[PDB]
Design a protein around this ligand. Structure first.
Ligand SMILES: Nc1ncnc2c1ncn2[C@@H]1O[C@H](COP(=O)(O)OP(=O)(O)O)[C@@H](O)[C@H]1O
Ligand SMILES: [Mg+2]
Ligand SMILES: [Mg+2]
Ligand SMILES: [Mg+2]
Ligand SMILES: [Mg+2]
Ligand SMILES: [Mg+2]
Ligand SMILES: [Mg+2]
Ligand SMILES: [Mg+2]
Ligand SMILES: [Mg+2]
Ligand SMILES: [Mg+2]
Ligand SMILES: [Mg+2]
Ligand SMILES: [Zn+2]
Lengths: 155, 62, 57, 83, 116
RNA sequence: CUUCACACAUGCUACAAUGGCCGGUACAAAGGGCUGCGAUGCCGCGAGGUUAAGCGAAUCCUUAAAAGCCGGUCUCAGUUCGGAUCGGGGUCUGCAACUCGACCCCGUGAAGUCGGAGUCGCUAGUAAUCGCAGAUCAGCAACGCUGCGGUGAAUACGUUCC
């Protein structure tokens, strides 16, 4: 932090679907170190993402991510007696991270029975611009467009 | 509006419903789960079957 | 008023699991009232504390 | 005596006090300090005076105290209320 | 169905349905459903009528179920209160009878907080 | 020293489906053992009981690791979640378990549906979770403390603010 920028860990491709996004997706479903249960859910939510679309599930996921990747998020700061949020431009590698927890994070609190389809019913709707994960990327934008006046506080 | 008892994780759920009348079939292939702590709006032009959808839910029309 | 406001009431043969049956009149539709216990599968015909240590306690 | 193998343990110095009086139909009072002892039905007929720390609280083993210890009849902590 | 005045529910297996009797848990239920042949997958909406009759005399010849089993419990409390044992001077006051810590915890025999 | 009209503090188990209960089946490490450890066989639903093989131990015993993996089942309910309280019957150590022990079995089936203002820990084999062993010790309030491994994350723009 305060000295320099910290080094970054690499990633290994998933054997079932060769893609960096897939192991990065299994890694954030993971609670409690139970890793193979987290790959028994992401595989079961991509394989069920072709039973009712028929297309390739990686291509479904590269576009449901592209409907939840933000590019302009907002970031609080205090000046005097009023504290007011300043919009900042988002670097690309942070964008894929906020997008991907917006998939898993809303999928826990849907209304189905098991996590195998709750992640599937959110990858489905975000590929068409429907779900609650897509609701936030515009509220992240609309909160940060309704404050464009404070755009000269880049710290 | 008075406050009622505690609402569970299910409210009401409708899966692949079909209902109309004789030749005039007004509901085909509808599936939804009705949410918890929200306000649900039914939008549709007249003569489409918005009142009859609540006949099935209340249970006066199978 | 002893006309067509009272419920339907015709004779009704009733059986139990004990096998003792009888024939009375009641409002069950079909003569089909079925019990699992009766008044002749039972008597009305003929019928800690100091017992603690007797298992050498 | 908690286990049924070794039988119901009751201290010896009170067993001799009840056997000397039960044979000739004599029901005195007995001063004792053996809270650990269990009720045998051998001394249904007469009373006791069990210790608590102040003074020997009297107890009359009537018919259904048996099985329980003597010391369940002396509460040893007073507590008659915070107010 | 109706085993002994107890109103067995519907659409629930017999492995769990007999547990609703006051006196049958998960272990005595497994030996009611072995001595009378009834398997551990039989739903309650398709019970045979005489198959319940086998089910209601193995219980009423060996076990003790309610009506008098509630009378077993509260009369055994009723004896301890009147003999004057300390454990019956403990049911008089709503305090734990098994030497539990009464300083910080023990809300269950007492009730929730009142902050006087 | 353990008492309770109540307040604080450190923990543990939880409120479930990334789960509960059943049947299969794998991969550890570091440790203790002659006042002992108890293989194996027989009996007991179970804690245990009883015989006695081997061993001052890289021998032999402690030992069978638990999560995990493959199948079934419950289908979102204060429940097949939860295991508190209380009845009943036992086992073990010990002169003795009543105030005041741990474990087992049977029935019961409490409060709780992710917690107000505030606040805490963690930058990598780390947090999170999963058991195993030791020191005290006759037995234990062993969920505590000291240790060991199994599985194994996310993020760090930056020094404006505390
Ligand atoms: N009792 C009935 N029998 C047959 N058809 C009916 C009956 N009541 C309503 N409908 C049909 O229902 C359709 C619309 O339902 P309706 O309740 O009128 O919807 P909305 O309330 O949205 O106007 C109409 O086509 C009408 O013909
Ligand atoms: Mg209408
Ligand atoms: Mg102390
Ligand atoms: Mg729930
Ligand atoms: Mg349970
Ligand atoms: Mg298992
Ligand atoms: Mg055996
Ligand atoms: Mg499974
Ligand atoms: Mg409640
Ligand atoms: Mg550091
Ligand atoms: Mg010890
Ligand atoms: Zn009869």
């Amino acid at each position: 932090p305060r000295k320099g920028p910290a080094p970054k860990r690499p990633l290994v491709n998933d054997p079932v679907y060769g893609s960096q996004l897939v192991t990065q997706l299994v890694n954030k479903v993971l609670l409690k170190g139970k890793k193979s249960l987290a790959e028994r859910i992401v595989y079961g939510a991509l394989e069920q993402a072709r039973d009712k679309t028929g297309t390739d599930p990686v291509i479904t996921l590269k576009r449901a991510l592209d409907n939840v990747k933000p590019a302009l998020e907002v970031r609080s700061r205090r000046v005097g007696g009023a504290t007011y949020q300043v919009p900042v431009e988002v670097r690309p590698d942070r964008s894929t991270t906020l997008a991907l927890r917006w998939l898993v994070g809303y999928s826990r609190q849907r209304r189905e029975k098991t996590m195998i389809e709750r992640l599937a019913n959110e990858i489905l709707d975000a590929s068409n611009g429907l779900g609650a994960s897509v609701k936030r990327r515009e509220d992240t934008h609309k909160m940060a467009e309704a404050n464009r006046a404070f755009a000269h506080y880049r710290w | 509006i008075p406050v009622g008892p505690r609402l569970g994780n299910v409210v009401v759920e409708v899966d692949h419903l079909d209902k109309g009348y004789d030749g005039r079939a007004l509901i085909k292939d509808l599936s939804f789960s009705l949410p918890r702590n929200g306000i649900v709006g039914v939008i549709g032009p007249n003569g489409v079957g918005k009142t009859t959808l609540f006949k099935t839910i209340v249970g006066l029309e199978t | 008023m002893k006309s067509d406001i009272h419920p339907a009431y015709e004779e009704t043969t009733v059986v139990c699991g004990c096998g003792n049956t009888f024939q009375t009149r009641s409002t069950k539709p079909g003569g089909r009232i079925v019990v699992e216990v009766c008044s002749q599968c039972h008597p009305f015909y003929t019928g800690g504390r100091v017992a603690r240590f007797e298992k050498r306690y | 005596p908690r286990s049924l193998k070794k039988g119901p343990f009751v201290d010896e110095h009170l067993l001799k006090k009840v056997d000397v009086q039960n044979e000739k139909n004599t029901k005195q009072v007995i001063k004792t300090w053996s809270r650990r002892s269990t009720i045998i039905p051998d001394f249904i007929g007469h009373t006791f005076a069990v210790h608590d720390g102040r003074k020997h609280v009297p107890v009359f083993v009537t018919e259904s105290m048996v099985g329980h210890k003597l010391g369940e009849f002396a509460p040893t902590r007073t507590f008659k209320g915070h107010i | 169905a109706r085993l002994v005045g107890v109103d067995l529910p519907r659409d629930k297996r017999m492995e769990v349905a007999l547990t609703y009797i006051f006196g049958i848990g998960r272990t005595r239920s497994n030996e009611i459903l072995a001595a009378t042949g009834i398997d551990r997958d039989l739903r309650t909406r398709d019970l045979t009528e005489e198959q319940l009759i086998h089910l209601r005399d193995y219980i009423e010849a060996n076990l003790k179920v309610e009506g008098d089993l509630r009378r077993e419990v509260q009369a055994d409390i009723r004896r301890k209160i009147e003999i004057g044992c300390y454990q019956g001077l403990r049911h008089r006051r709503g305090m734990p009878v098994r030497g539990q810590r009464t300083k910080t915890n023990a809300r269950t025999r007492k009730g929730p907080k009142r902050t006087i």
